[PDB]
């Protein structure tokens, strides 16, 4: 049987799928994530602040 990928298939997004939230997913915290500090963030935290010292 043809072992190759099949061109001639619908390349468009499919507007026929459950559009609702899926209540069947692991609801628990995920113990498989980088636990380190992540050195990839803006070190200049100054574009947005409350001009009033108090809120």
């Amino acid at each position, epitope marked *: 049987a043809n072992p190759n990928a099949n061109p001639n298939a619908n390349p468009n997004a499919n507007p026929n799928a459950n559009p609702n939230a899926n209540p069947n997913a692991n609801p628990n915290a995920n113990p498989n994530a980088n636990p*380190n*500090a992540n050195p990839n963030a803006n*070190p200049n935290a*100054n574009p947005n602040a409350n001009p009033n010292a108090n809120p």
Partner: antibody, heavy 120, light 112 residues
Framework: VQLVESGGGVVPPGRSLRLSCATSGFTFSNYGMHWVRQAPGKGLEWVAIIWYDGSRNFYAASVEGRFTISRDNSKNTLYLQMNSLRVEDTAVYYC??????????????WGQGTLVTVSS | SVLTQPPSVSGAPGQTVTISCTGGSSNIGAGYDVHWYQQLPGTAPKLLIYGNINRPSGVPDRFSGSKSGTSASLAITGLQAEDEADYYCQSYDRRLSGSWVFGGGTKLTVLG
């Protein structure tokens, strides 16, 4: 914006050297800083970053634990204290002003650097 | 060397030359923005390109950038004698502890 560097020179291996990047033309206290280095004849290597308020610091793996980065915001000055210098640390060190775009950061102004030589 | 750059590029003044930089799924194809710096023989690198395509107002409109998958790019049109320089790419490698990673640089020689 202007960054000025001083502190290079020849130091016997094992000894320390301090670099100092004097700055002006911007509010030093509102920006983080970087150091990079370039050994003669080599390309660029990132060395360290310090957050605008000193709340977070990161080091290249090859220098972590030997180098200390700090800021004296009141003097508009960035420092790099290198202890236990090795011959392999010979390089022009440069300071740069941290900048950030979207998914990654960058430098948007560079100092001129100074040459640190470690030699017997 | 984290990002891969060819060691050399050249052409005559008036010609178009390009400088490439290829990464992997951890640094360029990873969605991290690629930046470019130009270093002249007696000084520090200068920001040439940022955000893959943009550039400082201090850069002549002779330079521009791009990106496709893991391949980043710098194009120089209207090559001048004054473009002799070391061109470096920069990105962020999610597998490493450093804020910035660099390629080894490409040496541009203008055949003047």
């Amino acid at each position: 914006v202007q960054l000025v560097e001083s502190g290079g020179g020849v130091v016997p291996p094992g000894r320390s050297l301090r670099l100092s990047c004097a700055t002006s033309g911007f509010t030093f206290s509102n920006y983080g800083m970087h150091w990079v280095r370039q050994a003669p004849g080599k390309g660029l290597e990132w060395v360290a970053i310090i957050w605008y308020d000193g709340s977070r610091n990161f080091y290249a793996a090859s220098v972590e634990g030997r180098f200390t980065i700090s800021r004296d915001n009141s003097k508009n000055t960035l420092y790099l204290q290198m202890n236990s210098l090795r011959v392999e640390d010979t390089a022009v060190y440069y300071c740069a002003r941290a900048a950030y775009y979207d998914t990654s950061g960058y430098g948007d102004y560079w100092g001129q650097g100074t040459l640190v030589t470690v030699s017997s | 060397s984290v990002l891969t750059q060819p060691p050399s590029v050249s052409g005559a003044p008036g010609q178009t030359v390009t400088i490439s930089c290829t990464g992997g799924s951890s640094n360029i194809g990873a969605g991290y923005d690629v930046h470019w710096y130009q270093q002249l023989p007696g000084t520090a690198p200068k920001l040439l390109i940022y955000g893959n395509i943009n550039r400082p107002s201090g850069v002549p409109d002779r330079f521009s950038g791009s990106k496709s998958g893991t391949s980043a790019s710098l194009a120089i049109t209207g090559l001048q004698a004054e473009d002799e320089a070391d061109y470096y790419c920069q990105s962020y490698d999610r597998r490493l502890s450093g804020s910035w990673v660099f390629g080894g640089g490409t040496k541009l020689t203008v055949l003047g």
